[PDB]
Amino acid sequence: MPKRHREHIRKNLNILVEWTNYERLAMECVQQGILTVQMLRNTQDLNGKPFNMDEKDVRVEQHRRLLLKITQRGPTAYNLLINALRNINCLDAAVLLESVDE
Amino acid sequence: MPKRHREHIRKNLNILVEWTNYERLAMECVQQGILTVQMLRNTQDLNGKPFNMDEKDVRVEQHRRLLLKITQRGPTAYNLLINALRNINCLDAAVLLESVDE
Amino acid sequence: MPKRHREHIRKNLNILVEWTNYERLAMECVQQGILTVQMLRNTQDLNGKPFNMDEKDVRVEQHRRLLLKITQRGPTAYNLLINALRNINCLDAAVLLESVDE
Amino acid sequence: MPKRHREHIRKNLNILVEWTNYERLAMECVQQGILTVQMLRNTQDLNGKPFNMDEKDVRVEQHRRLLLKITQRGPTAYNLLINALRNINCLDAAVLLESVDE
Amino acid sequence: MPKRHREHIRKNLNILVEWTNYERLAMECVQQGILTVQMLRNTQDLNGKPFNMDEKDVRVEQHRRLLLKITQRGPTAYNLLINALRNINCLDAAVLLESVDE
Amino acid sequence: MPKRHREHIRKNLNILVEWTNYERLAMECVQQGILTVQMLRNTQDLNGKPFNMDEKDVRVEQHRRLLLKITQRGPTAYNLLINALRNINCLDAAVLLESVDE
Amino acid sequence: MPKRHREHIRKNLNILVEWTNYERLAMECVQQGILTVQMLRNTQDLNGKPFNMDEKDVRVEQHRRLLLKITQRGPTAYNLLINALRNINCLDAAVLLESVDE
Amino acid sequence: MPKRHREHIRKNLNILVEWTNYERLAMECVQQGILTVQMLRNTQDLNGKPFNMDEKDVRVEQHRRLLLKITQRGPTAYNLLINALRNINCLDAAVLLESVDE
Amino acid sequence: MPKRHREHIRKNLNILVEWTNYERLAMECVQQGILTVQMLRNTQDLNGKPFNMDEKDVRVEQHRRLLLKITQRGPTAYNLLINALRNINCLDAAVLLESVDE
Amino acid sequence: MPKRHREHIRKNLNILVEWTNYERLAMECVQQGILTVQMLRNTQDLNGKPFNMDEKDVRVEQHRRLLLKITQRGPTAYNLLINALRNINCLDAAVLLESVDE
Amino acid sequence: MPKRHREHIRKNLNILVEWTNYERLAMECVQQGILTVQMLRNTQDLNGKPFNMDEKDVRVEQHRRLLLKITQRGPTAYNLLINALRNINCLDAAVLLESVDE
Amino acid sequence: MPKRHREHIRKNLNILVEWTNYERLAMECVQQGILTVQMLRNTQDLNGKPFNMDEKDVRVEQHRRLLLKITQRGPTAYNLLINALRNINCLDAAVLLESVDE
Amino acid sequence: MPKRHREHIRKNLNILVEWTNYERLAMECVQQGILTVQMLRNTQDLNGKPFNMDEKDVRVEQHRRLLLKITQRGPTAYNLLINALRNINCLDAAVLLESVDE
Amino acid sequence: MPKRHREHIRKNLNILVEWTNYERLAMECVQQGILTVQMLRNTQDLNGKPFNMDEKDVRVEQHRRLLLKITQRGPTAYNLLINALRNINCLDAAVLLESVDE
Amino acid sequence: MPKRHREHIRKNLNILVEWTNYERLAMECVQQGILTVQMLRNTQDLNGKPFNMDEKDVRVEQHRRLLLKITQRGPTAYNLLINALRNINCLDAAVLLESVDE
Amino acid sequence: MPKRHREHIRKNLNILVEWTNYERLAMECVQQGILTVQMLRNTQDLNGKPFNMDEKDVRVEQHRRLLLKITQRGPTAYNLLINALRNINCLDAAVLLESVDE
């Protein structure tokens, strides 16, 4: 997708990784029409070293690894994520991801 | 300031009211070169009825009343708030408030 | 989607209703990112009178009711159905549905 | 005949080899004003090795060898085959062979 | 077909009705891809009154009724008749029917 | 005379050599204002070897040698022959010789 | 034929009626490809009253009636008469009839 | 005088040498305002050898030598001779000499 | 002839009537190709009353009546009279009649 | 004076030397405003040899020598001589000398 | 003659009437080619009343009446008088009468 | 002053030296606003040799030497002299000196 | 800020350092939204040698060091200082600092 | 003088009334080439009521009345006052009065 | 003379009436080529009432009446007076009267 | 000041040095706003040698040295001197110094 889009979710990868539940997001995004049993695996999992890292901080990394792969996708990725998140019921981040346009 | 700016802080008045401490913001914003002992009073305080409302929810309203008045201000209001927040050390919202441009 | 597309699946609604398994199609199309537990219900089911009609001829009607709703959809509907059918492994109808273009 | 025509019957040589009876087609096509006692012989027959191949699969090959020779013909070949097939009463393939135009 | 064609076979309906055998023509023309069991019937037969007319003169009328119906046909009718007659082996009339062009 | 004229009587030298009596033609053509006691002699006669050839086939050759010399003539040759033949009462060949024009 | 031609043979109808023998002319002109057993009759004969007129003067009138009818004819009439007279061996009048041109 | 004039009396030197009396012409032409006692002498006389030639044929030569000298003259020679001959009362040659014009 | 010519011989009708002998002129002018036994009569003679007039003065009048009629003539009249007078050997008046030109 | 003037009196030096009395001219011309006791002397006299010449012919020469000197003069010479001669009462030469103009 | 000429001799009629002898002028001017026995009479004489006037003053008036008549004359009058006076040997007035030009 | 002025008084230095008294002129010209006790001295006097010359002829020379010096002067010299002379009461020379203009 | 601004406060650094109290200015300017605990320190303090300098003259130097740093600032520096001074209640210098514009 | 000048000394009438001694100014300004014993009187004096006003405040008013009258003056008034003040040795106000330009 | 000249001697009629002696001027100006025994009288004298006026003041008036009349004169009046005064040896007023030009 | 100004007071330095009292001028000119205790000293005094020169002639030199220095001055020098002299009450020289303009 465009340049001004990757930069968006890039810097704002914290708010989006915070307000949306990840279970409710991952299982839905794959579910949405984007990634697959393979993609979400590699995204949801990590390098393996992350084990050094305490519990609080692995789910957040995961969730942060998600949007990076979603951004990876085809140009709808915006229109895909905005809707998926419209359903996750994280409207306050759907705005975040959409308002930069218009 | 411009139209596309009021709409920004308008819809995204939750993220900004969340990540930035309000004490550290109010006492700094007034401190910044914007509002005054009078402004911040009327903003920090509310109608009076808010008393019906429990503790959790009055500080959040307050903080949400702040950005509305900041938005009220002169066209720097952007460049004012982005910096004030650069100091509040809520960088993850300074981005939010800035990234919509560029 | 375009006019020359509805006419396509319209007249050629027999070949497409024949070569593709319906189970493998319905459960996949809904699955694909098109219709929903509601859509496929109303499509997979019929008016109710169809009961007059013998077994051979209700599944064929069903399957024929599917493509009509798929055609109903947004302009990808082509690009959606061509791929869904690329997976159903009814390539000899994916061609049918695609070859009219190019 | 044109390029976009050979490609048509080429990829869609299965549907056309399926829905139309071959007897009713061969004896009619030659009969139609296309091939001859010589053509249809060489088309209806094959290399000779096809003997390795079981019954189901030789008539289908034959029938598939027909359209290839029909395609071989002069530019009417379309308008010839569409009509011949209009008579074979395989309308659902006459459509197939025609609908790509218009 | 064109005007200058009907006039041709019109005035020159004697030479063409003379040099070509009619059996070898009728059974071939129908055979050719022009008329049908119905056409050739009505052409080969006549009003019924022709009975007044002696044998010599009914076959000639018949044969003369043929070219009139052939002329009746679609614009190939020229290119159809020239070839059919190329086979009847009445080359000396195929010339007649062709030479007016070029 | 023109090119498209020699080609005419050339290929159609059979019909014209058939329908018109030769006596009634030769004695009239010379008579017409074309050839002379010398021309018609050399045309009506032949090389001398023609003797190998049976009766049926010498008069036909003769008659066929006539039109070749008539064609030889000045540009009226058309308008000359068409009229001469209008008198020979071989109208069905006068047409032949004329209809190629107009 | 043209105007300046009728005027020619008109005024110079004496020289032409004098130098050319009439027998050798009449029997040749008709013979030439101009008039007919009917024309030459009416020309060679006269009204009937000419009987008042002596022998010398009826043949001269006749001969003078000839050129008038020859002039009557089609535009070759010049080119016809000049040649006919080239044969009559009245060259000294063929010149007369030709020299006015060129 | 012009070219097309010398050619006239040149070829038509017989008719003019025939119809006009020579006495009535010579004695008048000189008389007319053209030649002189010297000219007409040399014209009326000849080389001297003409003696070989019989009577009929010397006066005709003479008379034929006249028009040649008249033609020799100045451009009126036409308008001179036409009038002189208008008087000689050989009108039927005055026409001859004039009609080529107009 | 032109205007400036009549005026010439008009005023200068004395010199011309003086230097040229009249016998040698009259008998020559008529002789020249101008007037006739009739003209010269009426010119050479006079009204009849001239009888009142003595001898000296009638020949002079006559001679003066001549040039008036010569002037009367066709446009050569100049070129006619100049030459006639060139012969009369009245050169000193031929000059007179010519010199006004050039 | 002009060229066409010297030529005039030049060729017409006879008429002018004839009709005008010389006494009445010389004594008047000098008298007129042209020549002088010196000019007229040399003109009226001659070379001296003229003595060979008889009386008739010396006065005529003299008189002829006059006009030559008058012509010699300034451009009026025309307008001078025409008037002088208008007085000499040789009007019939004043015309001569004038009429060439106009 | 021109205007600027009459004005000249008009105002300067004293100098010119003074320096030139009148006898030597009158008898010369008439003599010159201007006036006549009649003109000079009427100029040289006067009204008749001049008798009142003494001798000195009548010759001066006379002489003054001369130039007035000379001025009266044709346009040479200048070129006439300048020369006449060039001879009278009144050069000092010839200058007067000429110098106004150039 | 101009050229055409010096030439004037130059040639006409006699009339002007005659009609105007010199005393009345010299004593006035100097008096006028032109020359001076020095100028008029050298003008009124002469070389000294003039003594050879008799009385009549020295005053005239003097007076003639005056106008030469007056002419010598500035461009008014005309307008100066014309007026000075208008006073000297030699009007008949004031005219002389003025009339050449206008 | 602009050039014509630095020159302003530069030359007029005395009036501005005089009329505005420094305490009321420093503590307000820093307070205003310009300098900081660091800036005002280095400005309010000096090199250290200033100790040679008596009391009167160090506060004045200080105050004079202030405006130099204020001038140092961003282009508002004008609009900043004019307002800060509008509050210091040194209006008579706010004018000074503003009036140079407009 | 210009508008932007009156406004200058108008608002900045305090600084200028402060830094320049008035004695040293008044006695110099009048002295300068501006006002007069009359002007400075009316300026230096006041309405008369000023008596209500204490000593401090009358000299200041006076001095303030001065510049108002100086401003009143002709357009040099600037260039006059700037120099006068250059001498008063109030350079720090000469700047004030000048710096607004340039 | 011009306007800017009358104004000159008008206002500067004192200096000119002062520096130039009047005797030496009057007797010279009249003498110069300007006024006359009549002019200078009326100028040098006055109305008659001037008698009221003492001696000092009548000569000055006189002298002042002079230049007024000199100014009255023709356009040289400048060039006349400047020179006259160049001689009066009042150079310091000749300058006055001249310097206004150039 | 301009060129045409220095030349003015230059040549007319006598009239101006005469009519204006010097005391009343010097003490006023310096007084005027031009020179100074230094200028007027050096102008009012001289080289020192002037002592050779008698009293009458030193004050005049002085006064003449003044205008030279006044001329020296800035371009008003005209407008300065004209007014200063308007006060000196030497109006008759103020005119002198002004009238050269306008």
PDB file of N, CA, C and O in Angstrom, chain A residues 4 7-8 11-12 14-15 18-19 91-93 95-96 98-102, chain B residues 4 7-8 11-12 14-15 18-19 91-93 95-96 98-102:
ATOM      1  N   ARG A   4       2.725   6.816   2.968  1.00  0.00           N
ATOM      2  CA  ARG A   4       2.129   7.513   4.109  1.00  0.00           C
ATOM      3  C   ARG A   4       1.241   6.614   4.979  1.00  0.00           C
ATOM      4  O   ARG A   4       0.677   7.072   5.974  1.00  0.00           O
ATOM      5  N   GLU A   7       4.070   4.418   7.415  1.00  0.00           N
ATOM      6  CA  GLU A   7       4.572   5.344   8.425  1.00  0.00           C
ATOM      7  C   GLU A   7       3.570   5.536   9.531  1.00  0.00           C
ATOM      8  O   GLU A   7       3.940   5.726  10.677  1.00  0.00           O
ATOM      9  N   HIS A   8       2.298   5.558   9.155  1.00  0.00           N
ATOM     10  CA  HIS A   8       1.208   5.686  10.107  1.00  0.00           C
ATOM     11  C   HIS A   8       1.202   4.602  11.187  1.00  0.00           C
ATOM     12  O   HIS A   8       1.443   4.867  12.377  1.00  0.00           O
ATOM     13  N   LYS A  11       4.718   4.393  13.458  1.00  0.00           N
ATOM     14  CA  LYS A  11       4.886   5.203  14.659  1.00  0.00           C
ATOM     15  C   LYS A  11       3.748   4.964  15.646  1.00  0.00           C
ATOM     16  O   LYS A  11       3.960   4.945  16.859  1.00  0.00           O
ATOM     17  N   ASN A  12       2.542   4.785  15.120  1.00  0.00           N
ATOM     18  CA  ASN A  12       1.369   4.548  15.953  1.00  0.00           C
ATOM     19  C   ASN A  12       1.102   3.062  16.161  1.00  0.00           C
ATOM     20  O   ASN A  12      -0.048   2.624  16.188  1.00  0.00           O
ATOM     21  N   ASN A  14       1.889   1.542  18.831  1.00  0.00           N
ATOM     22  CA  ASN A  14       1.706   1.359  20.271  1.00  0.00           C
ATOM     23  C   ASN A  14       0.249   1.464  20.681  1.00  0.00           C
ATOM     24  O   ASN A  14      -0.281   0.616  21.401  1.00  0.00           O
ATOM     25  N   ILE A  15      -0.397   2.521  20.210  1.00  0.00           N
ATOM     26  CA  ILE A  15      -1.804   2.743  20.493  1.00  0.00           C
ATOM     27  C   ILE A  15      -2.610   1.571  19.944  1.00  0.00           C
ATOM     28  O   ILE A  15      -3.465   0.999  20.635  1.00  0.00           O
ATOM     29  N   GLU A  18      -2.250  -1.526  21.787  1.00  0.00           N
ATOM     30  CA  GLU A  18      -2.730  -1.405  23.149  1.00  0.00           C
ATOM     31  C   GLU A  18      -4.233  -1.586  23.235  1.00  0.00           C
ATOM     32  O   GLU A  18      -4.710  -2.469  23.949  1.00  0.00           O
ATOM     33  N   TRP A  19      -4.978  -0.775  22.494  1.00  0.00           N
ATOM     34  CA  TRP A  19      -6.428  -0.741  22.680  1.00  0.00           C
ATOM     35  C   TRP A  19      -7.169  -1.998  22.172  1.00  0.00           C
ATOM     36  O   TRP A  19      -8.193  -2.371  22.740  1.00  0.00           O
ATOM     37  N   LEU A  91     -13.056   0.764  18.174  1.00  0.00           N
ATOM     38  CA  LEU A  91     -13.385   1.960  17.395  1.00  0.00           C
ATOM     39  C   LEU A  91     -12.385   3.099  17.601  1.00  0.00           C
ATOM     40  O   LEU A  91     -11.998   3.761  16.645  1.00  0.00           O
ATOM     41  N   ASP A  92     -11.988   3.337  18.850  1.00  0.00           N
ATOM     42  CA  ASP A  92     -10.996   4.367  19.177  1.00  0.00           C
ATOM     43  C   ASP A  92      -9.593   4.164  18.576  1.00  0.00           C
ATOM     44  O   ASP A  92      -8.706   4.998  18.772  1.00  0.00           O
ATOM     45  N   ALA A  93      -9.396   3.073  17.842  1.00  0.00           N
ATOM     46  CA  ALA A  93      -8.152   2.853  17.112  1.00  0.00           C
ATOM     47  C   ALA A  93      -8.489   2.751  15.634  1.00  0.00           C
ATOM     48  O   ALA A  93      -7.638   2.975  14.782  1.00  0.00           O
ATOM     49  N   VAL A  95     -10.541   4.733  14.374  1.00  0.00           N
ATOM     50  CA  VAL A  95     -10.426   6.154  14.111  1.00  0.00           C
ATOM     51  C   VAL A  95      -8.956   6.443  13.875  1.00  0.00           C
ATOM     52  O   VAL A  95      -8.615   7.030  12.865  1.00  0.00           O
ATOM     53  N   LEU A  96      -8.102   6.071  14.821  1.00  0.00           N
ATOM     54  CA  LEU A  96      -6.683   6.344  14.713  1.00  0.00           C
ATOM     55  C   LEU A  96      -6.129   5.984  13.331  1.00  0.00           C
ATOM     56  O   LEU A  96      -5.471   6.781  12.683  1.00  0.00           O
ATOM     57  N   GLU A  98      -7.789   5.526  10.595  1.00  0.00           N
ATOM     58  CA  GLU A  98      -8.538   6.081   9.468  1.00  0.00           C
ATOM     59  C   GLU A  98      -8.404   7.604   9.304  1.00  0.00           C
ATOM     60  O   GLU A  98      -8.261   8.112   8.185  1.00  0.00           O
ATOM     61  N   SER A  99      -8.441   8.311  10.430  1.00  0.00           N
ATOM     62  CA  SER A  99      -8.465   9.769  10.523  1.00  0.00           C
ATOM     63  C   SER A  99      -7.315  10.482   9.830  1.00  0.00           C
ATOM     64  O   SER A  99      -7.472  11.608   9.384  1.00  0.00           O
ATOM     65  N   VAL A 100      -6.141   9.862   9.823  1.00  0.00           N
ATOM     66  CA  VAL A 100      -5.016  10.337   9.015  1.00  0.00           C
ATOM     67  C   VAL A 100      -5.331  10.532   7.534  1.00  0.00           C
ATOM     68  O   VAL A 100      -4.587  11.214   6.816  1.00  0.00           O
ATOM     69  N   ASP A 101      -6.422   9.938   7.071  1.00  0.00           N
ATOM     70  CA  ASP A 101      -6.870  10.167   5.713  1.00  0.00           C
ATOM     71  C   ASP A 101      -7.998  11.174   5.803  1.00  0.00           C
ATOM     72  O   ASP A 101      -8.169  11.799   6.848  1.00  0.00           O
ATOM     73  N   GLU A 102      -8.734  11.353   4.711  1.00  0.00           N
ATOM     74  CA  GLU A 102      -9.880  12.263   4.662  1.00  0.00           C
ATOM     75  C   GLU A 102      -9.427  13.725   4.736  1.00  0.00           C
ATOM     76  O   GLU A 102      -8.376  14.038   5.294  1.00  0.00           O
TER      77      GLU A 102
ATOM     78  N   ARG B   4      -9.144  20.502   9.529  1.00  0.00           N
ATOM     79  CA  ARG B   4      -8.602  19.149   9.659  1.00  0.00           C
ATOM     80  C   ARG B   4      -7.806  18.930  10.953  1.00  0.00           C
ATOM     81  O   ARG B   4      -7.296  17.835  11.192  1.00  0.00           O
ATOM     82  N   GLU B   7     -10.868  18.319  13.956  1.00  0.00           N
ATOM     83  CA  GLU B   7     -11.405  16.977  13.749  1.00  0.00           C
ATOM     84  C   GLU B   7     -10.473  15.930  14.298  1.00  0.00           C
ATOM     85  O   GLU B   7     -10.913  14.899  14.779  1.00  0.00           O
ATOM     86  N   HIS B   8      -9.179  16.179  14.149  1.00  0.00           N
ATOM     87  CA  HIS B   8      -8.152  15.292  14.667  1.00  0.00           C
ATOM     88  C   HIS B   8      -8.256  15.041  16.173  1.00  0.00           C
ATOM     89  O   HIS B   8      -8.567  13.926  16.628  1.00  0.00           O
ATOM     90  N   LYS B  11     -11.922  13.436  17.417  1.00  0.00           N
ATOM     91  CA  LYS B  11     -12.143  11.993  17.438  1.00  0.00           C
ATOM     92  C   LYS B  11     -11.082  11.289  18.279  1.00  0.00           C
ATOM     93  O   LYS B  11     -11.376  10.320  18.979  1.00  0.00           O
ATOM     94  N   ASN B  12      -9.851  11.778  18.202  1.00  0.00           N
ATOM     95  CA  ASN B  12      -8.746  11.197  18.955  1.00  0.00           C
ATOM     96  C   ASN B  12      -8.546  11.880  20.303  1.00  0.00           C
ATOM     97  O   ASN B  12      -7.415  12.071  20.752  1.00  0.00           O
ATOM     98  N   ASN B  14      -9.562  10.614  23.027  1.00  0.00           N
ATOM     99  CA  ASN B  14      -9.483   9.542  24.018  1.00  0.00           C
ATOM    100  C   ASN B  14      -8.055   9.096  24.268  1.00  0.00           C
ATOM    101  O   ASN B  14      -7.605   8.982  25.409  1.00  0.00           O
ATOM    102  N   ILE B  15      -7.342   8.845  23.179  1.00  0.00           N
ATOM    103  CA  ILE B  15      -5.950   8.437  23.256  1.00  0.00           C
ATOM    104  C   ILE B  15      -5.150   9.535  23.948  1.00  0.00           C
ATOM    105  O   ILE B  15      -4.364   9.273  24.870  1.00  0.00           O
ATOM    106  N   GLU B  18      -5.742   9.841  27.508  1.00  0.00           N
ATOM    107  CA  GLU B  18      -5.350   8.646  28.226  1.00  0.00           C
ATOM    108  C   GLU B  18      -3.863   8.628  28.525  1.00  0.00           C
ATOM    109  O   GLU B  18      -3.467   8.542  29.688  1.00  0.00           O
ATOM    110  N   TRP B  19      -3.043   8.736  27.489  1.00  0.00           N
ATOM    111  CA  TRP B  19      -1.608   8.514  27.666  1.00  0.00           C
ATOM    112  C   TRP B  19      -0.879   9.630  28.446  1.00  0.00           C
ATOM    113  O   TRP B  19       0.091   9.348  29.146  1.00  0.00           O
ATOM    114  N   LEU B  91       5.356  11.079  24.288  1.00  0.00           N
ATOM    115  CA  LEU B  91       5.779  11.010  22.887  1.00  0.00           C
ATOM    116  C   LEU B  91       4.807  10.216  22.011  1.00  0.00           C
ATOM    117  O   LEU B  91       4.508  10.624  20.895  1.00  0.00           O
ATOM    118  N   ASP B  92       4.335   9.075  22.511  1.00  0.00           N
ATOM    119  CA  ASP B  92       3.360   8.247  21.794  1.00  0.00           C
ATOM    120  C   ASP B  92       1.995   8.903  21.519  1.00  0.00           C
ATOM    121  O   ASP B  92       1.126   8.290  20.893  1.00  0.00           O
ATOM    122  N   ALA B  93       1.810  10.139  21.970  1.00  0.00           N
ATOM    123  CA  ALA B  93       0.611  10.905  21.645  1.00  0.00           C
ATOM    124  C   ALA B  93       1.043  12.155  20.899  1.00  0.00           C
ATOM    125  O   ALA B  93       0.260  12.748  20.167  1.00  0.00           O
ATOM    126  N   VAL B  95       3.243  11.961  18.696  1.00  0.00           N
ATOM    127  CA  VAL B  95       3.196  11.356  17.380  1.00  0.00           C
ATOM    128  C   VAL B  95       1.755  11.431  16.909  1.00  0.00           C
ATOM    129  O   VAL B  95       1.504  11.926  15.826  1.00  0.00           O
ATOM    130  N   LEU B  96       0.827  10.906  17.700  1.00  0.00           N
ATOM    131  CA  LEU B  96      -0.571  10.885  17.319  1.00  0.00           C
ATOM    132  C   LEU B  96      -1.042  12.239  16.778  1.00  0.00           C
ATOM    133  O   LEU B  96      -1.628  12.327  15.711  1.00  0.00           O
ATOM    134  N   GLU B  98       0.781  14.674  15.685  1.00  0.00           N
ATOM    135  CA  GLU B  98       1.623  15.245  14.634  1.00  0.00           C
ATOM    136  C   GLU B  98       1.554  14.500  13.290  1.00  0.00           C
ATOM    137  O   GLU B  98       1.504  15.122  12.223  1.00  0.00           O
ATOM    138  N   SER B  99       1.540  13.172  13.367  1.00  0.00           N
ATOM    139  CA  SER B  99       1.608  12.250  12.236  1.00  0.00           C
ATOM    140  C   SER B  99       0.533  12.441  11.177  1.00  0.00           C
ATOM    141  O   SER B  99       0.759  12.147  10.015  1.00  0.00           O
ATOM    142  N   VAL B 100      -0.659  12.848  11.599  1.00  0.00           N
ATOM    143  CA  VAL B 100      -1.710  13.269  10.671  1.00  0.00           C
ATOM    144  C   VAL B 100      -1.290  14.351   9.678  1.00  0.00           C
ATOM    145  O   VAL B 100      -1.959  14.566   8.660  1.00  0.00           O
ATOM    146  N   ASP B 101      -0.191  15.034   9.970  1.00  0.00           N
ATOM    147  CA  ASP B 101       0.355  15.992   9.030  1.00  0.00           C
ATOM    148  C   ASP B 101       1.509  15.295   8.337  1.00  0.00           C
ATOM    149  O   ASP B 101       1.631  14.077   8.443  1.00  0.00           O
ATOM    150  N   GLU B 102       2.323  16.055   7.612  1.00  0.00           N
ATOM    151  CA  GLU B 102       3.500  15.528   6.920  1.00  0.00           C
ATOM    152  C   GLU B 102       3.095  14.637   5.742  1.00  0.00           C
ATOM    153  O   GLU B 102       2.020  14.037   5.738  1.00  0.00           O
TER     154      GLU B 102
END
